[PDB]
Amino acid sequence: IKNGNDRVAALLVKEGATLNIENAGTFLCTVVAKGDSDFLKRLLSNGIDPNSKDYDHRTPLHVAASEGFYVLAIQLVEASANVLAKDRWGNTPLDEALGCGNKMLIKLLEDAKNSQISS
Amino acid sequence: IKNGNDRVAALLVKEGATLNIENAGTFLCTVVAKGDSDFLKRLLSNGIDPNSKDYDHRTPLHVAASEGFYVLAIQLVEASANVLAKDRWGNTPLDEALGCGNKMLIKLLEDAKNSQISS
Amino acid sequence: IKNGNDRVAALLVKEGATLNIENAGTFLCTVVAKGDSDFLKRLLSNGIDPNSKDYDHRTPLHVAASEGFYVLAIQLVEASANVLAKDRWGNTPLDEALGCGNKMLIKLLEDAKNSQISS
């Protein structure tokens, strides 16, 4: 997936494959810091957990909501990632997006909040 | 350095080798979580820059303050990694150290912060 | 858009064309320096996002506030590019608009800021 060879990657999972890496919460939030949207597309297709905690129990939304990757947030929420998490000092990802200020993210956060409320 | 062969590292620095890695701050924010103080000492042996910050602008002082360490903080104090730099959340490491607790290390951190401010 | 042929733009958007550029936020700062309001008005016809910020985190409201414009200030008011976002220097655009002057536009900006805050 790093080299973008999905054809072999597709048949690799068919025969039985999985991702076994450490600090995945810290690793993935580094990827979203660079801003590359192509890289995160094929990771979620292989079942990677999007709610993995970082070194400070920081969800990827904490990095995502602060900077405001509204477009790079639809793919993550397609995996039913939790939005009721907390920051290191205590901050909801939906509240984190609201604090920074983003109308597009607020609507997305409200939809996530509505989905979370509906459960 | 990773393999622990400090003896052979003397020839490398004598030859004129230098340390240069990408996202150094993020690397510094997870080794403290690992707690490899002995391996951390070798990092300071080569004089690596301690002012590196991650995507969240969190210096190693910030995570150490949250971790509530004493021996590592004293070792970090020897490295002299800034005094009080606001992170993404805007909380100074001195405030984080006081808020976290560890009065045995907070008093040392406060004395170090006062000395750093005076200097 | 650059050549001013708005007639072919209607067919292009009907075909489903998208406006994506790199370092977009910096572009909205230099255009208002040139004062091409007619060219700027065409940009909003395609629904370009006005919340983009440069490397200094300066929204188009910030540079317009320093520029002390009135017609453009009325123009970006309809764009609704946030209310008051701190820049690298930490100065809100409303504070910058008030500090710069232009009471003819500052009063309109203050009313727009008050309306944006209420909304």
Swiss-Prot record, chains A, B, C:
Annotated compartments: Membrane
Family membership: Belongs to the potassium channel family. Plant (TC 1.A.1.4) subfamily.
Induction statement: In roots, strongly inhibited by 2,4-dichlorophenoxyacetic acid (2,4-D), abscisic acid (ABA) and benzyladenine (BA) treatment or by potassium starvation.
Biological source species: Arabidopsis thaliana (Mouse-ear cress)
Record's subunit section: The potassium channel is probably composed of a homo- or heterotetrameric complex of pore-forming subunits.
Renumbered ranges of ANK repeats: 1-21, 23-52, 56-85, 89-119
Further information: Loss-of-function mutation skor-1 leads to a reduced shoot potassium content.
Domain notes: The segment S4 is probably the voltage-sensor and is characterized by a series of positively charged amino acids. The pore-forming region H5 is enclosed by the transmembrane segments S5 and S6 in the Shaker-type (1P/6TM) and contains the GYGD signature motif which seems to be involved in potassium selectivity. The KHA domain (rich in hydrophobic and acidic residues) present in the C-terminal part is likely to be important for tetramerization.
Tissues expressing the protein: Expressed in root pericycle and xylem parenchyma, and in flower at a lower level.
Role, per record: Highly selective outward-rectifying potassium channel. Involved in potassium release into the xylem sap toward the shoots. Assuming opened or closed conformations in response to the voltage difference across the membrane, the channel is activated by depolarization. The voltage-dependence of the channel is abolished by internal or external acidification. May interact with the cytoskeleton or with regulatory proteins.
Descriptive protein name: Potassium channel SKOR
